[PDB]
Structure formats: C-alpha cells, structure tokens
Amino acid sequence: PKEMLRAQTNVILLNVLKQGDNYVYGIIKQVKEASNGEMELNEATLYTIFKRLEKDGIISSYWGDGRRKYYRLTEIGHENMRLAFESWSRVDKIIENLEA
Amino acid sequence: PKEMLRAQTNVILLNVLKQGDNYVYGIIKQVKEASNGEMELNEATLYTIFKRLEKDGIISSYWGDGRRKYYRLTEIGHENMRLAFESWSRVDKIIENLEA
C-alpha cells in the first residue's frame, strides 16, 4: 500500500533527524544500517519527502561547510513528532486492552 | 492532525473487529472501555469509516437475529492487517536501532 509506505518512510526520516541534523546520503546510510540492509532508500525519494516537509515547516535546510545540504527538525517539527508519538502510544495501549 | 486521527481510528476499529464480529454500539462501548473513557467514538464517525472499509472490501456487513448491523473483517481485511502489523513492526525496530 503506497500511502502507508510513505507514512512509514516519513516516520523513519523524522526519527533520523530527531537524532541530529543530517544530509541525504548520511540518512540513507543510517536507515540502511538500522534496517539491516532491508531498507535502501533512494536519493530522489528523500528529496520528494523533504520538499513536502520543508513546505510544511516541519524541517528546514542549511548548507554545511562539495557542500552538503543539511536538514534539521524545526521547533514545530519536534512538537508535532512528540504529539504523534504520544497519541499513537495511546492507540497501542487501547489495542493492548482490546486483546487481553 | 485530522488525517492521522482518522488513521488511528481506522486501526482501532479494525483491531476491534479482529477480536470478533461486532456492531456499531458494541464497538463504541469496547473502545470507550479500552481507552479508559478517553475515546468516545460517534455513531456517525463509524458509519463514515465503515462505508469506506466496505467499499474497499476490508469488512463486510450482515444482519443479526430491532436487528443490528454486524461487521466482520474479510479474508482480504485480515491479510491487510497482518501485512500492516508486520511492516510497522519493522519500522519500530528500525527506530529502536536509530536511538541506541
């Protein structure tokens, strides 16, 4: 399901930036390692996602020191992540209660 | 965020039906209890969601024995849930690796 995959990719990318500002190739490498090789993201996929996140004010970009484009979570992006994490956590506990 | 709330509601409703076929008022009651009262879903919200899920072949409906409309996960709906659970579980382990 394409839109769920995009949702999953967005969550992963935001959690990478939560660990620290990063650039596209560094993010790909980190996600490849964290997924034991099972998730090899494409440069162009990240550009597509980051254009939307920047438009929405969730992340911002800035140049490093061949200069790399770095991305950072914004203050709004951090707050949105925390709200999402807390509400999905409540969902998890609801589902836990529905089973046993 | 409205679309994330809808995503959360969909997941909860599908997990209710995973526990057994059910009807709208019974589902509301179960979700209210499982959320310790914090999630009181509206009849009309469930109708909206169930119209889409039925259209998509994820659930189907049938009459009980004042007769209630019962809903069941379909074979496709069960398979979609399992695939979603497995892939989001992989996401969780990816995020775990990104932290420590």
Ligand code: HEM
């Ligand atoms: C860790 C925090 C999580 C976030 C931020 C998150 C976010 C999202 C988003 C954004 C979507 C798609 C809806 C949209 O893009 O508007 C989605 C879909 C979904 N999530 Fe999560 N999610 C999280 C955790 C979980 C967990 C723990 C489960 C386990 C039950 C789960 C199950 C699902 C399912 C089944 C869908 C598919 C919804 C559909 O196809 O309609 N998610 N999630």
